[PDB]
Amino acid sequence: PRRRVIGQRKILPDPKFGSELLAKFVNILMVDGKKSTAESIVYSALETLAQRSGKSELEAFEVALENVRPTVEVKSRRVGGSTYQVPVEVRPVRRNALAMRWIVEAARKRGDKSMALRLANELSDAAENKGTAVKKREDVHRMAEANKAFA
Amino acid sequence: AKQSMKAREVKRVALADKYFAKRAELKAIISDVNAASDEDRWNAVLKLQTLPRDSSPSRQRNRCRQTGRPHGFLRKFGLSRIKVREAAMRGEIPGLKKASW
Amino acid sequence: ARIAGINIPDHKHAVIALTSIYGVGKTRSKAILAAAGIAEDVKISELSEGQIDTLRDEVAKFVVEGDLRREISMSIKRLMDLGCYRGLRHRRGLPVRGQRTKTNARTRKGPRKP
Amino acid sequence: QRIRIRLKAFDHRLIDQATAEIVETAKRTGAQVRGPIPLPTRKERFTVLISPHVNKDARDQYEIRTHLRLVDIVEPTEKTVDALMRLDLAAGVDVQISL
Amino acid sequence: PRSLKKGPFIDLHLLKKVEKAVESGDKKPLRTWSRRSTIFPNMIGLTIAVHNGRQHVPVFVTDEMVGHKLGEFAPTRTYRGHA
Amino acid sequence: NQYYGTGRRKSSAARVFIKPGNGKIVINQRSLEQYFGRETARMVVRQPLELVDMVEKLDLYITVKGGGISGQAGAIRHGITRALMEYDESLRSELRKAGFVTRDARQVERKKVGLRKARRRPQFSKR
RNA sequence: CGGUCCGGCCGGGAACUCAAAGGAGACUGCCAGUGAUAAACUGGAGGAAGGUGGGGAUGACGUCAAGUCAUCAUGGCCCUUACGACCAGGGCUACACACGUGCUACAAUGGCGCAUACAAAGAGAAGCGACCUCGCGAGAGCAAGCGGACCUCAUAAAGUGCGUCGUAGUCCGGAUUGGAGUCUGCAACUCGACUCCAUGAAGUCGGAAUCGCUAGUAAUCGUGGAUCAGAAUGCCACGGUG
Ligand SMILES: [K+]
Ligand SMILES: [K+]
Ligand SMILES: [K+]
Ligand SMILES: [K+]
Ligand SMILES: [Mg+2]
Ligand SMILES: [Mg+2]
Ligand SMILES: [Mg+2]
Ligand SMILES: [Mg+2]
Ligand SMILES: [Mg+2]
Ligand SMILES: [Mg+2]
Ligand SMILES: [Mg+2]
Ligand SMILES: [Mg+2]
Ligand SMILES: [Mg+2]
Ligand SMILES: [Mg+2]
């Protein structure tokens, strides 16, 4: 919008672990409004990640997300006759949104036998600093530093 | 609508009352019958085909009363979507007015 | 295993496996298994010979495989010999049951050609 | 026995004054009355294309609201039922009666 | 198909002609417009000229035809390739 | 005597009676855990009594009608909050902060002629 | 509160939901700060609601010689043993192809099977049609009630619990085609809908390109109505999850 600026809509924290961040993650994994399906998938993935890691569920999720949150992104900036890619310091809320989106979209396209297990594997790899979500973060950073000349 | 169409429709409507409104027994009681001999049912089936075809109610078009238009008829009013609105906005219909919700 | 339906079912729940017999759908499959006295969950593996024999005996009560195939063909042949409207639609490879032919009908007509 | 009156009209104010007349004349005639109950307002919705040709999206939407009122005469003495039979109302009201 | 409760349908004005044609032995083709009439067994061996919309088409009632409608043997539309 | 609240959400309406007692909850003569199978509803029905910290000191009898699972859950939360503000008006300033007193007005938007939905427009093509 | 057969079903209450007539409330009204002693902007209190609270109806002067002489009315022109009128059959449903708008899919965030929760809004007399009996089913027989807050249409589906399938052109998908039927109707050949048995295409997320949506919205799941003897994946409405 060009007139307005919008105040954020009220979210409700996750009922089992009390996290609004996990609530956002559920809301991103949700499809067609089937909230409870996404909740079941997320809870199964988190408990299996917990028993793999020897960590609490939110602790394992947080340490995974740490490994994939980007620090910079590339933005198209116009000039009177040209357009340049320029690196921009992405703000933390968008960092979390990006990391969750990348985790979810990476897991979705895995081959493993169920979405809960796909998700658990992708979170393990992310916590292990490996795999598709991490390579996504990585190449974003590569592009940013390759464009650093215009910053 | 072409005046012939109006004459044709009213002819059908009149003719339907002279037969099927009374002789519906021939189909509903006999040609449909299960409790009665198939020879009587067969004879009734053959007899029904002898009634004048335009006497079947299934052949009535149900045209608009004010202009004879076939399409867009509304069964509550007897009028087409056009004449119904013309009467409506002129307030000739006793309780109709524009809705909002 | 193999059945009076000449094919060879294997490694699958009986209620699905029987549906390999040309002429046996899900409800026939269930009727066969009910009359043979076999639980629909049971695999063909670990099925008794005193059970496959009665599966064969029970399937033998239905027209299946070649018996069905030829029958179907014969009926279609008859139409084409009659030269009825359906026979024309059959011989000419067009939809028989009144589907649109302005477009669609592409399963029947086969892949489009300029 | 009771007698029961259902009023239908296309105007809630007309139906109102009809019920007011009923109740006032009845109680003036010594009737016991169980008071006017508003039954749910059955309403009809219509949609019409307003162009003589094409323009499928150009439409008007209309409604008719039928207002209902129920009133019970719980002790209909002869004079009360007679008086209630004698009343006349504006043509916008349909009165339907039962015993 | 017609409800089995009712039995098959034939037009009276055709049946009256099938009768005398059977008495005569199909001496001449029986013209009809009753494309909707069912082929009854008594019709076998007759020739009926069924209307197609612009012409009467000779159908010779073969025994295999019983129970079909006459109109199934008189195609109404002409197609012979686009080019 | 009973302390009362009506609450509603979407098309759902709830009557809530609360009384001093050992924490019992009953909805349409069914247990909370039997009536609602979804944990979100089981949480939101508690939320107000959790924040007031009386879950073990009050019992309540509820009936609820209309709408689906979440509509009825929100209607019950609203009725609970009204009733308990009737029980202790001093809690209103707290419940205002909790946001429960606001009757959530987000009704369903009616379909409109020429649109497939509330706002979904048919697919457009230039040609 | 008494009774109970556990059914608001009974006596009973007018509390509560609701029905629907009338009234109240929102006004930048109040309080800081900014501003040109202005109009108004930022934040706060109270309140169910806060700055057009949400949605609808409401469409200025005029543009496009825009659409309709086939709703209708009308100037002019043309026919008047035919460009008028009646009838049966056929066609508008063709089919080398090309484009638009939709429906169902390509699956495991799923399919199948068993059990069990929670809606709103409409229609009904040439009508809606219960219970019960018959049929695998579509339906048939008998027949109660209802011009309806009463009776019927009519057990919402997504969902929740449990089992099973195991990444397969499959227990995905259900086009096509054979067989047997039901119903409406004078009549289902061309050319109806639906049910049962069998058959089980293409399709594994779609080239250049392109479309909708700012919150109870998109997405997704069911329900009703008009036209209507029968005949919606279209149109007009409703609610669930979100
Ligand atoms: K098969
Ligand atoms: K003219
Ligand atoms: K469609
Ligand atoms: K219909
Ligand atoms: Mg008709
Ligand atoms: Mg367009
Ligand atoms: Mg205005
Ligand atoms: Mg022009
Ligand atoms: Mg013209
Ligand atoms: Mg004709
Ligand atoms: Mg057409
Ligand atoms: Mg696959
Ligand atoms: Mg907008
Ligand atoms: Mg909706």
Short mmCIF file of C-alpha atoms in Angstrom, two decimals, chain B residues 31-34 41-42 45-46 49-50 53, chain E residues 2 5-6 8-12 15 36 40:
data_model
loop_
_atom_site.label_atom_id
_atom_site.label_comp_id
_atom_site.label_asym_id
_atom_site.label_seq_id
_atom_site.Cartn_x
_atom_site.Cartn_y
_atom_site.Cartn_z
CA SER B 31 -50.75 -47.73 -17.87
CA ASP B 32 -48.86 -47.39 -14.59
CA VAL B 33 -50.83 -50.22 -12.95
CA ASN B 34 -49.10 -53.26 -11.48
CA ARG B 41 -52.28 -52.02 -19.42
CA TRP B 42 -51.29 -52.58 -23.06
CA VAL B 45 -50.92 -47.57 -23.39
CA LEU B 46 -52.17 -47.78 -26.97
CA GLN B 49 -51.46 -42.28 -27.88
CA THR B 50 -54.84 -41.46 -29.44
CA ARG B 53 -50.85 -34.51 -28.59
CA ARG E 2 -38.33 -47.54 -21.22
CA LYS E 5 -43.04 -52.04 -15.98
CA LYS E 6 -44.56 -50.55 -19.15
CA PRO E 8 -42.12 -51.82 -25.29
CA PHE E 9 -43.67 -48.98 -27.26
CA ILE E 10 -45.17 -49.00 -30.76
CA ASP E 11 -47.30 -46.42 -32.54
CA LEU E 12 -50.87 -47.48 -33.27
CA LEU E 15 -49.16 -51.26 -36.05
CA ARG E 36 -39.53 -43.84 -32.44
CA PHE E 40 -41.62 -56.00 -32.93
#
